[PDB]
Design an enzyme around this catalytic site. Structure first.
Site, PDB file in Angstrom:
ATOM      1  N   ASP A 223      -6.138  10.313   8.638  1.00 34.51           N
ATOM      2  CA  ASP A 223      -4.882   9.532   8.913  1.00 34.51           C
ATOM      3  C   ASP A 223      -3.573  10.280   8.160  1.00 34.51           C
ATOM      4  OD1 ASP A 223      -4.574   8.005   6.448  1.00 34.51           O
ATOM      5  OD2 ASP A 223      -6.492   6.994   6.974  1.00 34.51           O
TER       6      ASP A 223
ATOM      7  N   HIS B  28      -6.842  -1.012 -11.103  1.00 35.04           N
ATOM      8  CA  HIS B  28      -6.937  -0.275  -9.827  1.00 35.04           C
ATOM      9  C   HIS B  28      -6.090   1.060  -9.833  1.00 35.04           C
ATOM     10  CE1 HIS B  28      -8.091   0.020  -5.548  1.00 35.04           C
ATOM     11  NE2 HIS B  28      -7.147   0.745  -5.506  1.00 35.04           N
TER      12      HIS B  28
ATOM     13  N   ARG C 215     -11.204   2.368  -8.592  1.00 33.13           N
ATOM     14  CA  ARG C 215     -11.712   1.538  -9.857  1.00 33.13           C
ATOM     15  C   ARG C 215     -13.340   1.628 -10.154  1.00 33.13           C
ATOM     16  NH1 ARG C 215     -12.153  -4.322  -6.016  1.00 33.13           N
ATOM     17  NH2 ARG C 215     -11.767  -3.041  -4.059  1.00 33.13           N
TER      18      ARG C 215
ATOM     19  N   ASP D 289     -12.157   8.643  -3.307  1.00 31.72           N
ATOM     20  CA  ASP D 289     -11.490   8.688  -2.252  1.00 31.72           C
ATOM     21  C   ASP D 289     -10.183   9.609  -2.361  1.00 31.72           C
ATOM     22  OD1 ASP D 289      -9.395   7.823  -0.345  1.00 31.72           O
ATOM     23  OD2 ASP D 289      -9.871   6.000  -0.385  1.00 31.72           O
TER      24      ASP D 289
ATOM     25  N   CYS E 200      -7.185   9.583  -1.318  1.00 35.63           N
ATOM     26  CA  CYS E 200      -5.667   9.023  -1.673  1.00 35.63           C
ATOM     27  C   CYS E 200      -5.709   8.886  -3.120  1.00 35.63           C
ATOM     28  CB  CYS E 200      -5.526   7.733  -0.824  1.00 35.63           C
ATOM     29  SG  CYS E 200      -6.521   6.304  -1.434  1.00 35.63           S
ATOM     30  N   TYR E 201      -6.536   8.788  -3.714  1.00 36.33           N
ATOM     31  CA  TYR E 201      -6.640   8.535  -5.274  1.00 36.33           C
ATOM     32  C   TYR E 201      -6.067   9.798  -6.058  1.00 36.33           C
ATOM     33  CZ  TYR E 201      -8.370   3.916  -4.059  1.00 36.33           C
ATOM     34  OH  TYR E 201      -8.503   2.641  -3.696  1.00 36.33           O
TER      35      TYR E 201
ATOM     36  N   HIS F 261      -3.659   9.271   4.403  1.00 30.45           N
ATOM     37  CA  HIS F 261      -4.378  10.197   3.549  1.00 30.45           C
ATOM     38  C   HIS F 261      -4.043  11.455   3.499  1.00 30.45           C
ATOM     39  CE1 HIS F 261      -7.411   6.445   3.716  1.00 30.45           C
ATOM     40  NE2 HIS F 261      -7.588   6.929   2.411  1.00 30.45           N
TER      41      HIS F 261
ATOM     42  N   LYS G 296     -16.728   1.613  -7.803  1.00 28.52           N
ATOM     43  CA  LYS G 296     -16.520   1.954  -6.575  1.00 28.52           C
ATOM     44  C   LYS G 296     -16.513   3.300  -6.248  1.00 28.52           C
ATOM     45  CE  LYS G 296     -14.484  -1.176  -4.135  1.00 28.52           C
ATOM     46  NZ  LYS G 296     -14.965  -1.334  -2.742  1.00 28.52           N
TER      47      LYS G 296
ATOM     48  N   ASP H 201     -10.148   9.930   3.508  1.00 28.59           N
ATOM     49  CA  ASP H 201     -10.576   9.405   2.479  1.00 28.59           C
ATOM     50  C   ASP H 201     -11.924  10.317   1.928  1.00 28.59           C
ATOM     51  OD1 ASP H 201     -12.349   7.911   0.962  1.00 28.59           O
ATOM     52  OD2 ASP H 201     -12.353   6.220   2.316  1.00 28.59           O
TER      53      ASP H 201
HETATM   54  C1  LIG Z   1       0.915   1.384   1.305  1.00 26.59           C
HETATM   55  C2  LIG Z   1       0.673   0.851   2.967  1.00 26.59           C
HETATM   56  C3  LIG Z   1       1.586   0.847   3.903  1.00 26.59           C
HETATM   57  C4  LIG Z   1       0.914   0.170   5.124  1.00 26.59           C
HETATM   58  C5  LIG Z   1      -0.367  -0.231   5.186  1.00 26.59           C
HETATM   59  C6  LIG Z   1      -0.899  -0.518   4.097  1.00 26.59           C
HETATM   60  C7  LIG Z   1      -0.525   0.371   2.706  1.00 26.59           C
HETATM   61  C8  LIG Z   1      -1.678  -0.140   1.673  1.00 26.59           C
HETATM   62  N1  LIG Z   1      -2.872  -0.319   2.199  1.00 26.59           N
HETATM   63  C9  LIG Z   1      -3.530   1.076   2.419  1.00 26.59           C
HETATM   64  C10 LIG Z   1      -4.595   0.656   3.526  1.00 26.59           C
HETATM   65  N2  LIG Z   1      -5.411   1.705   4.210  1.00 26.59           N
HETATM   66  C11 LIG Z   1      -6.771   1.739   3.856  1.00 26.59           C
HETATM   67  C12 LIG Z   1      -7.383   2.504   2.823  1.00 26.59           C
HETATM   68  C13 LIG Z   1      -6.717   3.792   2.137  1.00 26.59           C
HETATM   69  N3  LIG Z   1      -8.030   4.037   1.282  1.00 26.59           N
HETATM   70  C14 LIG Z   1      -8.904   3.366   1.346  1.00 26.59           C
HETATM   71  N4  LIG Z   1      -8.490   2.301   2.299  1.00 26.59           N
HETATM   72  C15 LIG Z   1      -9.628   1.317   2.749  1.00 26.59           C
HETATM   73  C16 LIG Z   1      -4.686   2.660   4.842  1.00 26.59           C
HETATM   74  C17 LIG Z   1      -5.413   3.526   5.580  1.00 26.59           C
HETATM   75  C18 LIG Z   1      -4.782   4.279   6.701  1.00 26.59           C
HETATM   76  C19 LIG Z   1      -3.642   4.230   6.815  1.00 26.59           C
HETATM   77 BR1  LIG Z   1      -2.935   5.450   8.490  1.00 26.59          BR
HETATM   78  C20 LIG Z   1      -2.857   3.168   6.303  1.00 26.59           C
HETATM   79  C21 LIG Z   1      -3.300   2.425   5.543  1.00 26.59           C
HETATM   80  S1  LIG Z   1      -3.704  -1.151   0.907  1.00 26.59           S
HETATM   81  O1  LIG Z   1      -2.516  -1.579   0.205  1.00 26.59           O
HETATM   82  O2  LIG Z   1      -4.386  -0.373   0.159  1.00 26.59           O
HETATM   83  C22 LIG Z   1      -4.721  -2.608   1.587  1.00 26.59           C
HETATM   84  C23 LIG Z   1      -4.223  -3.591   1.982  1.00 26.59           C
HETATM   85  N5  LIG Z   1      -5.361  -4.128   2.382  1.00 26.59           N
HETATM   86  C24 LIG Z   1      -5.395  -5.557   3.030  1.00 26.59           C
HETATM   87  C25 LIG Z   1      -6.319  -3.487   2.215  1.00 26.59           C
HETATM   88  N6  LIG Z   1      -5.877  -2.370   1.696  1.00 26.59           N
HETATM   89  C1  LIG Z   2       3.158   0.683  -1.792  1.00 25.88           C
HETATM   90  C2  LIG Z   2       2.327   1.174  -2.911  1.00 25.88           C
HETATM   91  C3  LIG Z   2       2.548   2.126  -3.885  1.00 25.88           C
HETATM   92  C4  LIG Z   2       0.811   0.681  -2.762  1.00 25.88           C
HETATM   93  C5  LIG Z   2      -0.018   1.150  -3.602  1.00 25.88           C
HETATM   94  C6  LIG Z   2      -1.260   1.859  -3.040  1.00 25.88           C
HETATM   95  C7  LIG Z   2      -2.496   1.298  -3.400  1.00 25.88           C
HETATM   96  C8  LIG Z   2      -3.767   2.166  -3.183  1.00 25.88           C
HETATM   97  C9  LIG Z   2      -2.653   0.051  -3.432  1.00 25.88           C
HETATM   98  C10 LIG Z   2      -4.011  -0.657  -3.900  1.00 25.88           C
HETATM   99  C11 LIG Z   2      -4.113  -1.895  -2.662  1.00 25.88           C
HETATM  100  C12 LIG Z   2      -5.650  -2.278  -2.909  1.00 25.88           C
HETATM  101  C13 LIG Z   2      -6.163  -2.825  -4.447  1.00 25.88           C
HETATM  102  C14 LIG Z   2      -6.468  -2.822  -1.842  1.00 25.88           C
HETATM  103  C15 LIG Z   2      -7.684  -3.267  -1.747  1.00 25.88           C
HETATM  104  O1  LIG Z   2      -8.448  -2.861  -0.557  1.00 25.88           O
HETATM  105  N1  LIG Z   2      -8.803  -1.629  -0.910  1.00 25.88           N
HETATM  106  C16 LIG Z   2     -10.149  -1.195  -1.486  1.00 25.88           C
HETATM  107  O2  LIG Z   2     -10.739  -2.049  -1.587  1.00 25.88           O
HETATM  108  C17 LIG Z   2     -10.417   0.422  -1.265  1.00 25.88           C
HETATM  109  P1  LIG Z   2     -11.293   0.544  -2.897  1.00 25.88           P
HETATM  110  O3  LIG Z   2     -12.766   0.318  -2.531  1.00 25.88           O
HETATM  111  O4  LIG Z   2     -11.012   2.037  -3.511  1.00 25.88           O
HETATM  112  O5  LIG Z   2     -10.398  -0.297  -3.993  1.00 25.88           O
HETATM  113 ZN   LIG Z   3      -8.039   5.836   0.542  1.00 26.81          ZN
END
Ligand SMILES: Cc1ccccc1CN(CCN(Cc1cncn1C)c1ccc(Br)cc1)S(=O)(=O)c1cn(C)cn1
Ligand SMILES: CC(C)=CCC/C(C)=C/CC/C(C)=C/CONC(=O)CP(=O)(O)O
Ligand SMILES: [Zn+2]
Ligand SMILES: O=S(=O)(O)C[C@H](O)CNC1CCCCC1
Ligand SMILES: O=S(=O)(O)C[C@H](O)CNC1CCCCC1
Ligand SMILES: O=S(=O)(O)C[C@H](O)CNC1CCCCC1
Lengths: 482, 315
Positions: free
Chosen positions: A370, A250, A301, A307, A309-310, A373, A304, A363
């Site tokens: 947000d 990932h 990954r 996005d 953020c990647y 992103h 999928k 995204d």
């Molecule tokens: C780094 C940090 C810090 C606080 C909270 C979470 C995180 C890390 N999370 C990011 C969650 N995120 C959703 C998102 C981003 N791009 C695609 N998506 C779907 C998000 C969106 C918007 C705002 Br504003 C914040 C977070 S996460 O690990 O990927 C995670 C955990 N779970 C259960 C599912 N995903």
């Molecule tokens: C604190 C830090 C550096 C966190 C890592 C940031 C990320 C992006 C972590 C990945 C968390 C993860 C694998 C979440 C799974 O849920 N998210 C998704 O399914 C989004 P996608 O479809 O792109 O995998």
């Molecule tokens: Zn994202």
């Protein structure tokens, strides 16, 4: 500069072929392809002089993004109540990238807020220390935010971090598992995000020791999957007889693993860090860049969706993977490694909120922007705009100017022999770690600013993800190099 | 209307503690009265380290409002163990959470902690729960990671039988039949067939695996998951690319390709990558260079730079 980085508008847009086998994956992919290509079709090619009539202008809407970040948070943000340092970080780092200064009063509020999140026994939590226990992730976010907004004065927060070095270290050691993993907090999950956040902070604050790092390289290296990216964690079979990755490659975990591994390469321990397969990581990284129909954004990954953020998690890992591949090729013995132009186009065209609205980046089209992103799109944009290299001659220059007679008190290890063997070894470690932390440079003439210079944002540092101009005086403060 | 906790007889002895982020905090969140009140009393409970049923109830109130509150989850697990609560009841509650949409890094981790502490002699019913939870959400990353943990943890204790491993592979095959582009299930197949310590590796085993991989590619020639698995497989077992080349060659222009299925434009870039790599295996660097050049300038232009890098490597 752009011979091997074609514009999305210069390539043929074709859907991912079905092979006559429909599936849920393909349905979502096709729908996403339609969404992104439709926005591209409505938007003037950023590369064109004849900025087309009737089409949306893709210019980076910096003021809108600034306004988005300015604006007390509504009730829906309760879901991020345990992530307030991230909210601080996404905001202050984006403002740095966007070139917008906070006044001293606002910087002081930022510092004071974060210090209220610091526990006396060590580490920052996702909120006030009277409410939340310390956690590795907000510890990274608070530390970086203090690098951005703080200073060396009595009210600047750096002095508080310096006094907190021993307790932070003790928190890190409480988090440590014998296999090299770290729990993110007391009773918490073990993954490479924790490793990454811990190693960044330990590097910045001069609190790295041998006992802190034992097996940490092995944990990270076993996260690498057959695809070449890295999973969240590896499992130790009973130190261990074998370690096995626990899920898919990932972008989030690959960024954290590459960055962690990279930080470990400057630590002068014997046979350390255990190698990763750098070629496979680079391959995985470049393979996640989306096709022209999906705007050249990165997915996180295989199979999928792309996005914004990647752009940071995957695009920002590219220079790291690249450097590791370069080193492997030297130990056996130039075009861009990803499409730097297309990534910018995705950012400008697809990832920005539609003009004249709330601002912020997102995204993909159809998703609300947000802070997360916004920060990660812009961080990735910065990596695409500016060619970042880790320069051996810069590292050499750093070694030459390092003053080992200057420094904060050594950490007291948990176990009696957990420190460096002696003072020569410790100083050599301090020098290597500091010198390499400051080794990232923007290559002169490597700049590609799609759509013209008004789109230029500032240069972020790979691995750390703060501006060089923040990193240098911050790390110099903790190593007394100023 | 909401009844404040300062007015409840059950909470009369507790003096709430206010949130302390100082004056003028940045990123303040507008809290509901319910959430603020619960947290004010949580701060008091947690400060005094009270381990009670009321404290347990309060943690449930809080994590329902905020499933990502890791501190409150941590305090909840301490309560469960101090009070010697039924952990099976708590798993049922975690199930009920799922029915009410509540999820996070924290809910799955809580589940893991529960399973680790219960330490059942047979974890089959949790395996089935996990399977059921994936059907509507087939790529949920934390769910797949949790499944890997469960098998890995319970197998080290010697609690996964051969029949259990066998049915897991059956279930994985069904996931990939329903959606062959499900990379998460390909990852799981890798664990089941290749990486787990108890996996069988014989010449027949490698044969069977190759057949499955090749059939998958032939079914979906453009499926990046299946190509990466093929490449991962060959690399991991040090197997030459050349002898399999006949099965891949038609995508560049043991199970062989079908007339190709409809909607299969050629060449498949990863087939060319396979061809270039096979040329390298043969020390035919000029032929490999040529393939990389075509990848760069024509067939996979998004990675023009990477394929040029690969090209330069040869020349
Ligand atoms: C780094 C940090 C810090 C606080 C909270 C979470 C995180 C890390 N999370 C990011 C969650 N995120 C959703 C998102 C981003 N791009 C695609 N998506 C779907 C998000 C969106 C918007 C705002 Br504003 C914040 C977070 S996460 O690990 O990927 C995670 C955990 N779970 C259960 C599912 N995903
Ligand atoms: C604190 C830090 C550096 C966190 C890592 C940031 C990320 C992006 C972590 C990945 C968390 C993860 C694998 C979440 C799974 O849920 N998210 C998704 O399914 C989004 P996608 O479809 O792109 O995998
Ligand atoms: Zn994202
Ligand atoms: O973030 S940006 O898109 O660059 C800035 C906004 O478009 C503001 N545009 C103003 C509207 C009124 C006339 C002066 C310009
Ligand atoms: O003195 S320290 O241990 O460093 C910091 C204080 O103990 C803070 N404890 C909080 C109580 C309420 C729940 C979250 C923890
Ligand atoms: O510096 S250059 O790249 O040559 C050209 C400028 O940056 C172009 N920026 C535009 C100016 C008019 C408003 C929309 C932005």
């Amino acid at each position: 500069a752009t011979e091997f980085t074609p514009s999305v508008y210069s390539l043929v847009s074709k859907p991912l072929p079905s092979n006559s086998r429909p599936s849920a994956t393909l349905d979502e992919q096709a729908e996403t392809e339609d969404l992104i290509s439709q926005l591209f079709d409505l938007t003037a090619d950023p590369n064109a002089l004849v900025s087309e009539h009737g089409k949306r202008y893709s210019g980076l809407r910096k003021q809108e993004h600034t306004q988005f970040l300015a604006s007390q948070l509504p009730g829906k943000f309760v879901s991020l109540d345990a992530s307030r340092p991230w909210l601080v970080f996404w905001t202050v780092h984006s403002l740095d990238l966007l070139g917008v200064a906070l006044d001293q009063g606002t910087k002081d509020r930022v510092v004071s807020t974060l210090l209220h999140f610091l526990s006396p026994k060590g580490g920052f939590g996702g909120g006030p220390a009277n409410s939340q226990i310390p956690h590795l992730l907000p510890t990274y976010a608070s530390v970086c935010s203090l690098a951005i907004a703080g200073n060396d004065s009595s009210t600047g927060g750096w002095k508080d971090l310096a006094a907190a070095r021993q307790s932070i270290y003790e928190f890190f050691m409480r988090c440590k598992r014998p296999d090299g993993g770290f729990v993110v907090c007391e009773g918490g999950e073990v993954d490479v995000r924790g490793t990454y956040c811990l190693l960044v902070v330990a590097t910045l604050l001069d609190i790295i020791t041998p006992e802190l790092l034992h097996n940490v390289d092995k944990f990270v290296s076993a996260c690498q999957t057959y695809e070449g990216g890295f999973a969240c964690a590896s499992f130790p079979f009973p130190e261990p007889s074998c370690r096995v990755s626990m899920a898919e490659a990932h972008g989030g975990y690959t960024s954290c693993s590459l960055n962690s591994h990279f930080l470990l390469t400057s630590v002068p321990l014997p046979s350390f860090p255990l190698s990763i397969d750098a070629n496979a990581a680079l391959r995985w990284t470049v393979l996640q860049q989306g096709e022209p129909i999906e705007g050249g954004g990165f997915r996180g990954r295989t199979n999928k969706l792309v996005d914004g953020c990647y752009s940071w998690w995957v695009g920002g890992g590219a220079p790291v993977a690249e450097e590791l591949v370069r080193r492997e090729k030297s130990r056996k013995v130039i075009p861009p490694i990803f499409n730097r132009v297309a990534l910018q186009e995705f950012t400008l065209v697809a990832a920005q909120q539609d003009p004249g609205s709330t601002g912020g980046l997102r995204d993909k089209p159809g998703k609300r922007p947000d802070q997360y992103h916004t920060c990660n799109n812009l961080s990735g944009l910065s990596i695409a705009q500016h060619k970042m290299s880790h320069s051996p001659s810069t590292v050499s220059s750093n070694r030459l100017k390092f003053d080992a007679s200057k420094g904060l008190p050594a950490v007291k290890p948990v176990a009696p022999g957990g420190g460096w063997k002696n003072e020569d070894e410790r100083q050599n470690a301090r020098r290597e770690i500091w010198a390499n932390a400051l080794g990232w440079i923007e290559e002169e003439g490597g700049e590609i600013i799609v759509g013209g210079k008004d789109n230029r944002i500032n240069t972020t540092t790979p691995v750390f993800n703060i501006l060089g101009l923040r990193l240098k005086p911050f790390i110099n403060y903790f190593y007394c190099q100023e | 209307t909401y009844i404040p906790m300062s007015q409840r007889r059950s909470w009369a002895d507790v003096k709430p503690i206010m949130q302390d982020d100082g004056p003028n905090p940045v990123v303040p969140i507008m809290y509901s009265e319910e959430y603020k009140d619960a947290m004010d009393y949580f701060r008091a409970i947690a400060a005094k380290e009270e381990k009670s049923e009321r404290a347990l109830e309060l943690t449930e109130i809080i994590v329902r409002m905020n499933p990502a509150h890791y501190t409150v989850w941590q305090y909840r697990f301490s309560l469960l163990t101090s009070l010697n609560k039924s952990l099976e009841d708590e798993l049922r509650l975690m199930n009920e959470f799922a029915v009410q949409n509540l999820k996070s890094y924290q809910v799955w981790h809580h589940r893991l902690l529960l399973l680790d502490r219960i330490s059942p002699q047979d974890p089959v019913s949790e395996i089935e729960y996990i399977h059921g939870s994936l059907l509507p959400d087939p790529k949920n990353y934390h769910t797949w990671a949790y499944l890997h943990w469960l098998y890995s943890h319970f197998s080290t204790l010697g609690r996964i039988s051969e029949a259990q491993w066998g049915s897991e592979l059956d279930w994985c095959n069904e996931m990939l039949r329903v959606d062959g582009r499900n990379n998460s299930a390909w990852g799981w197949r890798w664990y089941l067939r290749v990486s787990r310590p108890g996996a069988e590796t014989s010449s027949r085993s490698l044969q069977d695996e190759l057949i499955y991989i090749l059939k998958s590619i032939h079914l979906i020639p453009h499926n990046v998951s299946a190509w990466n698995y093929l490449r991962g497989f060959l690399k991991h077992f040090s197997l030459p690319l050349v002898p399999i080349l006949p099965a891949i060659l038609p995508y560049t222009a043991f199970p062989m390709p079908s007339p190709l299925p409809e909607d299969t434009p050629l060449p498949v870039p990863l087939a060319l990558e396979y061809l270039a790599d096979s040329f390298i295996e043969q020390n035919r660097v000029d032929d490999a260079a040529k393939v990389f050049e075509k990848l760069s300038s024509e067939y996979d232009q998004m990675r023009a730079g990477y394929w040029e890098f690969r090209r330069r490597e040869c020349a």
